[PDB]
Amino acid sequence: QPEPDMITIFIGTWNMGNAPPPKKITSWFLSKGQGKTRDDSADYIPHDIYVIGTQEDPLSEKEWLEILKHSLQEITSVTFKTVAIHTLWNIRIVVLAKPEHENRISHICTDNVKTGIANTLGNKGAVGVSFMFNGTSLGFVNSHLTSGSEKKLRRNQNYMNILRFLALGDKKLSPFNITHRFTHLFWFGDLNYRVDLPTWEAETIIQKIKQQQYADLLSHDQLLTERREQKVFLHFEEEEITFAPTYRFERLTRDKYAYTKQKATGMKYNLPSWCDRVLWKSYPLVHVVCQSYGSTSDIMTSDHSPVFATFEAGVTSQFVSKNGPGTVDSQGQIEFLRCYATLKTKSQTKFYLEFHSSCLESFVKSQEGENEEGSEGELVVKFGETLPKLKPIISDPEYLLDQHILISIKSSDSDESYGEGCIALRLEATETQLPIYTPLTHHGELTGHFQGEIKLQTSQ
Length: 460
Ligand SMILES: *C(=N)c1nnc(-c2ccccc2)o1
Known about the structure:
A hairpin with a 7-residue loop joins strand 14 (351-356) and strand 15. This protein has helices at residues 26-29, 61-76, 152-165, 202-210, 215-218, 222-228, 397-400; strands at 6-15, 34-36, 49-55, 81-88, 91-97, 105-114, 125-133, 136-144, 184-190, 276-282, 288-295, 307-314, 333-343, 351-356, 364-365, 370-373, 379-384, 404-411, 417-424, 434-442, 445-457. With 460 residues, the chain is mostly beta strands. It is globular, with a radius of gyration of 23 Å. The strands form 4 sheets. It has a 7-stranded mixed β-sheet, with helices on one face. A 5-stranded mixed β-sheet has the order 6-7-8-9-10. The chain has a 5-stranded antiparallel β-sheet with strand order 16-17-13-21-20, with no helix packed on it. It folds into 2 domains: 2-320, Endonuclease/exonuclease/phosphatase (Deoxyribonuclease I, Chain A); 331-459, no CATH class. This is Phosphatidylinositol 3,4,5-trisphosphate 5-phosphatase 1.
């Protein structure tokens, strides 16, 4: 029975509003309702992996697992295996997988981050799960960020704390945060960004929603506008939104948005907003295609509607040759020519590189580059033709062209990373000098660039 080249992943995010769910929630897992919905002809076809993020979840892990496994069994006639479950307060992530995948999944990790200090510490944060699926690393984050239309900067701060401190994936990747540790990273939840229009426009907003005219609302969505200004979620993707705002509904119908200020809201307005979101980030030139992104119309116990997203995601096998794992394959090599890092730092220490990859026995440290000043004031770290020749464990091009090299540029003085990025080996040619490029980030913020040329030798 062959190993897969592609799987499908369901992502769900639902703020349950501290109320039990209704008897039937199958529409969520079927990607039915509003937006980009799944074809009816696919209803019996199980996804390979289901990742379910809840916020304001009143249920025990046991009670929710029961409901989820029953719902999928009813849809698919498959009994799904629990990969992981992790709860922080009322923020929960469940990962279920087809039973045929139980021996494909390893290195399962869970973690949580609590956001804010004292007053703002005690209900907002994130939970996460990671694991390996054969040769592919998968990460999943469910975050409940700060609420309130006036708090987009706090939401962005919450994102940066979660990014920095959530401990998932391979601990040997020490310079790298969750935004570089996974082939595919999915980040979802009640991100709590709002439609930033005047509160006196509430009824106008509601009439735009009733007409399914979202353009003038999305142009004021704080997550889209903060992403456009590179304030948050740098280098993540989101599918176009074609569903109505998922918040804030009167419970037990979807006919009414409840937006007016009340004692229960802290005398805040809740203009209709896309609070509930799914974003992703995959390594360069890995297949990932959003197949659905929408909200359910028939699950009405919460003041939020559930959001679904589905993906086709490229995966790779657990490659074994006669040589690696356990030794190098003399036929393989990775060379770097005419490379330099451009950094935004005002500091003047020496820098070196670290190359990290699953295709290497362990990470490689370069010698120091040569600092020059750039035209427009910046630091240019020149590596020229000085970078090491990397020795992959396997030389087979069917393995090696599917790999990636993570790069960290580190201060010689402090050994701290000033920038992280990733280079795909999915090249147009082997034995040929080709341009390479990655942006460099630190704490998820742009710090510079790395560019130069690569030359890849495979056994072909
Ligand atoms: C999760 N807690 C965890 N720790 N280490 C790893 C891991 C090791 C090797 C490859 C992938 C992940 O995951």
